Design an enzyme around this catalytic site. Structure first.
Site, PDB file in Angstrom:
ATOM      1  N   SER A   1       0.806  -1.215   0.000  1.00  0.00           N
ATOM      2  CA  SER A   1       0.000   0.000   0.000  1.00  0.00           C
ATOM      3  C   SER A   1       0.839   1.265   0.000  1.00  0.00           C
ATOM      4  O   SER A   1       1.984   1.273   0.449  1.00  0.00           O
ATOM      5  CB  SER A   1      -0.917   0.014   1.226  1.00  0.00           C
ATOM      6  OG  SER A   1      -1.585   1.254   1.367  1.00  0.00           O
TER       7      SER A   1
ATOM      8  N   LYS B   1      -5.889  -0.411 -11.151  1.00  0.00           N
ATOM      9  CA  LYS B   1      -6.765  -1.091 -10.195  1.00  0.00           C
ATOM     10  C   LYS B   1      -8.059  -0.332  -9.939  1.00  0.00           C
ATOM     11  O   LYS B   1      -8.027   0.842  -9.572  1.00  0.00           O
ATOM     12  CB  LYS B   1      -6.020  -1.296  -8.870  1.00  0.00           C
ATOM     13  CG  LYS B   1      -6.848  -1.885  -7.726  1.00  0.00           C
ATOM     14  CD  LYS B   1      -5.946  -2.192  -6.527  1.00  0.00           C
ATOM     15  CE  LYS B   1      -6.715  -2.714  -5.319  1.00  0.00           C
ATOM     16  NZ  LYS B   1      -7.498  -1.654  -4.645  1.00  0.00           N
TER      17      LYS B   1
ATOM     18  N   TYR C   1      -0.254   6.223  -4.826  1.00  0.00           N
ATOM     19  CA  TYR C   1      -1.274   7.229  -5.084  1.00  0.00           C
ATOM     20  C   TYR C   1      -0.525   8.460  -5.591  1.00  0.00           C
ATOM     21  O   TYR C   1       0.228   9.095  -4.851  1.00  0.00           O
ATOM     22  CB  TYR C   1      -2.062   7.569  -3.808  1.00  0.00           C
ATOM     23  CG  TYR C   1      -3.184   6.598  -3.470  1.00  0.00           C
ATOM     24  CD1 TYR C   1      -3.104   5.768  -2.351  1.00  0.00           C
ATOM     25  CD2 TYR C   1      -4.341   6.537  -4.254  1.00  0.00           C
ATOM     26  CE1 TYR C   1      -4.149   4.902  -2.013  1.00  0.00           C
ATOM     27  CE2 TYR C   1      -5.394   5.673  -3.926  1.00  0.00           C
ATOM     28  CZ  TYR C   1      -5.292   4.860  -2.803  1.00  0.00           C
ATOM     29  OH  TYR C   1      -6.331   4.023  -2.452  1.00  0.00           O
TER      30      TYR C   1
ATOM     31  N   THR D   1      -4.277   2.927  -8.437  1.00  0.00           N
ATOM     32  CA  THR D   1      -5.663   2.733  -8.041  1.00  0.00           C
ATOM     33  C   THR D   1      -6.443   3.936  -8.522  1.00  0.00           C
ATOM     34  O   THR D   1      -6.220   5.064  -8.073  1.00  0.00           O
ATOM     35  CB  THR D   1      -5.793   2.584  -6.519  1.00  0.00           C
ATOM     36  OG1 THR D   1      -5.173   1.358  -6.120  1.00  0.00           O
ATOM     37  CG2 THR D   1      -7.255   2.558  -6.110  1.00  0.00           C
TER      38      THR D   1
ATOM     39  N   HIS E   1     -12.898  -1.786  -4.902  1.00  0.00           N
ATOM     40  CA  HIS E   1     -12.269  -1.368  -3.648  1.00  0.00           C
ATOM     41  C   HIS E   1     -12.987  -1.989  -2.441  1.00  0.00           C
ATOM     42  O   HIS E   1     -13.119  -1.358  -1.385  1.00  0.00           O
ATOM     43  CB  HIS E   1     -12.329   0.161  -3.555  1.00  0.00           C
ATOM     44  CG  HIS E   1     -11.174   0.779  -2.832  1.00  0.00           C
ATOM     45  ND1 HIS E   1     -10.135   1.404  -3.490  1.00  0.00           N
ATOM     46  CD2 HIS E   1     -10.906   0.895  -1.510  1.00  0.00           C
ATOM     47  CE1 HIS E   1      -9.280   1.883  -2.602  1.00  0.00           C
ATOM     48  NE2 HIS E   1      -9.726   1.588  -1.393  1.00  0.00           N
TER      49      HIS E   1
END
Ligand SMILES: Cc1cc2nc3c(=O)[nH]c(=O)nc-3n(C[C@H](O)[C@H](O)[C@H](O)COP(=O)(O)O)c2cc1C
Ligand SMILES: Cc1cc2nc3c(=O)[nH]c(=O)nc-3n(C[C@H](O)[C@H](O)[C@H](O)COP(=O)(O)O)c2cc1C
Ligand SMILES: Cc1cc2nc3c(=O)[nH]c(=O)nc-3n(C[C@H](O)[C@H](O)[C@H](O)COP(=O)(O)O)c2cc1C
Ligand SMILES: Cc1cc2nc3c(=O)[nH]c(=O)nc-3n(C[C@H](O)[C@H](O)[C@H](O)COP(=O)(O)O)c2cc1C
Lengths: 329, 332, 327, 332
Positions: C105, C201, C129, C155, C225
């Site tokens: 992550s 994603k 991110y 994502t 998600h």
């Protein structure tokens, strides 16, 4: 009193340890199919035909040429001794008196000799789990033929055991022939049919593809079943799979089924959909747990009485008159 | 207070022994159809038409040429004395005052004479379970004609009794009355021609669920059909009566009047049965609930309430009269 | 004992404060998709083929050319420290020993250095991110490439955070932690500043799958998600079908969301997914037994896949086809 | 804290007597539509489009030419004083500050003068139940025009009151205020011409559920339609408002603005109604839950929360403005 199979289920639980009860339930993984086997039956709608002369309702039929009281038989289920001390001996006697077919499990609590001795005239099949040692195989088959068994049942949906979470959480320890602490394929069938004169019934078929293969290999019958949802979970309900299997076989050989049969109309529906007869798994064990031999006999009598009743109500004078016209499409 | 049929059901239970209550419920086997009769009604969606002049909503109609207050009648139900001492007598009186048709059961707690005497002018049919003796049969029929019954109801879905687990687990013992409860059939289509050829009374067949049997009913020239599954007390897992109604109505094509029972509990249920082709509906259990709660006044209240509800949904949906209730009201 | 992922879920709850447990559940709004992700899997019916020789069942496969023990990997999940003190370090070790891909992550409890140090040989991707300063972005990418990460996961379904009612009612306070305008064109750029394959994603539609291919990305993770973002969208296992149909095998398609048992994996693969990723189950594993927990969760799911493959008649991952699915 | 409309519902219950709470719930008969209005929304699946520039999400729009903060307004609901002493006055203030349309009920706790006085600049419509006495009618209409109301709402699905079992079992007694609660209709399509001859205000028909009635609405030249089933408080078992929206929108083909109410509780509900063709949605019960909890601040919070949610799902789904919310967003 116990007036239906559901009552035997509710009562059977109490006379058994959570360990033994969970084993008899033994749904695999998320347990979707176990429940679906019943819900699938309940969704089907019946179309009765009234004002027909139903003074004489015949519930008899035949499987592999042998006549039986009703299209209600006993499917193979291991270790009957966890439900009643007499184990398969009580089952055998009840099956004999009810005059239906009793398929003995490969993992019974008593030897085939002891079982047969308890009920000499009983109509019975033998479910044998094939092993690598074909000497054990042919000797078991000959032993079965010698003991009077009239058919060999080969269960094909258990190359490995299903994942029963409950048994695992209870860490097994099956405490009621002691309890045991596969590569068999279609070609192996050719060799089996060479060592026996007994008709072969394949148990566990759920698809038309496998049904076709079954006929190409010239077997004498098919038991549509998902092993009561104790093996591969999330497959079709046996009563639903019955349809495509029946359609593929086109009457060439007899097709039977098991999984979720609990009341008269379930039997009626299976027959109307093409099955020659149905087999009972857990209900037989519930019967044993409650009253031993009398328990098994009562379960069989109750289901037979219900079939007789719904046949009367729906307008079916005999098993031969049970057709798909009865089913709402 | 009791403001709807559901309230009468909840309250009825309390004034009755589990034995009697279970008998009135009496779902057969797994009890699928009992619940489905209600769920089937709830699934149907209505298409109301607003801004029409609904100042005068007429709820009247006729069955077999006889006029009634609303298309809401009493289906045959045995032994009313298990719900109220007066039994069918209280029911007859209520039915007469509400001006609807009361179908009397072949297994009533009181004799037909006593029942008719309690409500002389009441419109009523007689449900007779045919027996082996073609003399007992014709004498019962003549006795009915003599007493003023305007139709003979032949229930065909009960050649043998349904498997009601509860009654069995309670080992029966039906202890309500007079005409004792029978401790515990070969009638076929041909027997009709014979029965028909021995009575002039119009014959209504009760229990038809298929178009096949509806066709046979017409070939045998009967005067009416009550689409019904005996409230799920007989062959279980058959279609809900409100659903079976469709294929029966389509097969009959208006040749004879078609009615229905099974799960009617609220105004819109009545509305839907009518929009789907039924001439009127019959109530089974609700009548007994009414009896169990307040005797005659209970039965009358149940009838008044359902009638008031039908009147209200007709007003809301835009149907001035029973004649204006059409399938356009149903969402297909 | 804990014999399945559900057991780890039930047990995980107890070892965690309602605050942390609610955050790990975090269904958005009415919580429709969270439940649907599971229900959608249960509805699908399997068509087994029996009497085939299943003496040797192979559960291995490859993703982006890299081989893994089974098509079961770890989806990116923030702050592993709320479940176990060791956080991502325990996860990394478990993933390395299980030999599967571990997507780290962008909001881990430990630095990428500490994590990689804990499990040097581990196969891992990095979910980053993107932010506004393309210096930070390129420095994070170079830092990832330097540390051995073999893929970059972007994502796309989180331009803003989902509305998790529970967290709000508990007023946050994540105590084991931080207190978007990225568009398709920005991809062309990121691709210029990295040689790592890019996996998108969160794609749920064939339209976005088409755009993904037009922008030449290396893979897609069909996902919603876990129902923590836009609620009431299709279940990931259902959205999988149209994404796979649009992609036509040009690039590898994966999925996550509701995978809990062996047949779920079987179904995603039969439907066209190259492999699946686990979100919450990994955290449940950590909460229960740290590294051993994560490893157990992976082993259990693998054992189940191996079992249903045996039962259904699939000797290898390559033999898992849509003929297995009831249409 | 209260973070969504559901929380306001749960909390509102406590500050209110079962009598008043049951009245605000008031599902008719079996209460099928009340529940269905919500379940119908939950069944619809969204198709989000990601990686679009959502830095600026505009939630504004217009209804009848008037601009508003978001497509979220207040549907007509009687007697606000049962939820908060200030009644409609608090509601008016909150509506004015949120800059949305507030449709005032024909049965408010306070006079229109008092309400308007509390929030002078508020955008508001007036829902008037037409009466036999048209002198009362034209005077009410003129009175409304005088007070600044920008539209007349005519509710057509209530020629008579729905059958709310709860209220009946609680025997009414609505005890909240000023304008007393009435201790307890023949209006038809033709009457619409009469009304149109006494006022120039745009007319919005509330309660249409069918394309047939939508066609009639257009033939009578009204300015708008609020697709609604009165929150399942009138004719029960009709379609859910979000489902009926589709056929009404398809029939209208953009000729006039179509709105809806019934079951809107979360952002995506608003999103779905807009994607399906509605110009905006109206809230019924939520507004009363808001009042019950914190009076004016309660109503404002409910409005801000739903607005924030719409803004959030628009951002997530890829809709930069209300104009960009299309049916492509809906899974068919
Ligand atoms: C306790 C138990 C033991 C079983 N043992 C066997 C067995 O040895 N061999 C076999 O082919 N099937 C076995 N079965 C499965 C049954 O043959 C049958 O497929 C299934 O239980 C039928 O479903 P029902 O229980 O719904 O009737 C067993 C089932 C149970 C519940
Ligand atoms: C207690 C009870 C007794 C009944 N007795 C009869 C009877 O004697 N004859 C008959 O044709 N139907 C009988 N019925 C069935 C009704 O005629 C009717 O088919 C059914 O109950 C209608 O459904 P409802 O109860 O949902 O209204 C009986 C039903 C109940 C509940
Ligand atoms: C506590 C928690 C934190 C998560 N954090 C991230 C994150 O930082 N980045 C991301 O792309 N996904 C995140 N996810 C979502 C997962 O990557 C995955 O999409 C989803 O949870 C998979 O579903 P499952 O939980 O059913 O396995 C998170 C999920 C949970 C439960
Ligand atoms: C307590 C209460 C009072 C209402 N009063 C009216 C009214 O006077 N006039 C009208 O047209 N609708 C009235 N409605 C219905 C609303 O206008 C609206 O149709 C419905 O409640 C919307 O659904 P919702 O509550 O799900 O938002 C009322 C609803 C409630 C709950």
């Amino acid at each position: 009193p116990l007036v239906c199979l559901a009552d035997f289920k509710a009562h059977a639980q109490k006379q058994l340890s959570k360990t033994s009860w969970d084993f008899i339930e033994g749904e695999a993984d998320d347990g979707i199919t176990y429940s679906e086997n019943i819900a699938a039956f309940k969704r089907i709608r019946l179309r009765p035909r009234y004002l027909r002369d139903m003074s004489k309702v015949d519930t008899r039929t035949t499987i592999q040429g042998q006549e039986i009281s009703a299209p209600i038989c006993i499917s193979p289920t291991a270790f009957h001794s966890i439900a009643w001390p007499d184990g398969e001996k009580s089952t055998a006697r009840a099956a004999q008196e009810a005059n239906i077919c009793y398929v003995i499990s490969s993992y019974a609590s008593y030897s085939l000799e002891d079982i047969v001795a308890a009920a000499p005239e009983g109509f019975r099949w033998f479910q044998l789990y094939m092993k690598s040692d074909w000497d054990f195989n042919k000797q078991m088959v000959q032993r079965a033929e010698a003991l009077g068994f009239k058919a060999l049942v080969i269960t094909i949906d258990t190359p490995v055991l299903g994942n029963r979470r409950r048994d695992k959480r209870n860490q097994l320890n099956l405490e009621a022939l002691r309890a045991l602490k596969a590569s068999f394929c279609w070609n192996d069938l050719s060799l089996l049919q060479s060592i026996t004169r007994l008709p072969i019934i394949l148990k566990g078929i759920l698809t038309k593809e496998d049904a076709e293969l079954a006929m190409k290999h010239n077997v004498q019958g098919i038991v549509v079943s998902n092993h009561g949802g104790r093996q591969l979970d999330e497959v079709s309900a046996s009563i639903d799979a019955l349809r495509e299997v029946v359609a593929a076989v086109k009457g060439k050989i007899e097709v039977y089924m098991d999984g979720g049969v609990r009341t008269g109309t379930d039997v009626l529906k299976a027959l109307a959909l093409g099955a020659r007869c149905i087999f009972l798994g857990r209900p037989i064990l519930w019967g044993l747990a409650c009253k031993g031999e009398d328990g098994v006999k009562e379960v069989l009598d109750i289901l037979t009485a219900e079939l007789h009743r719904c046949m009367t109500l729906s307008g079916c004078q005999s098993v031969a008159e049970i057709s798909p016209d009865l089913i709402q499409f």
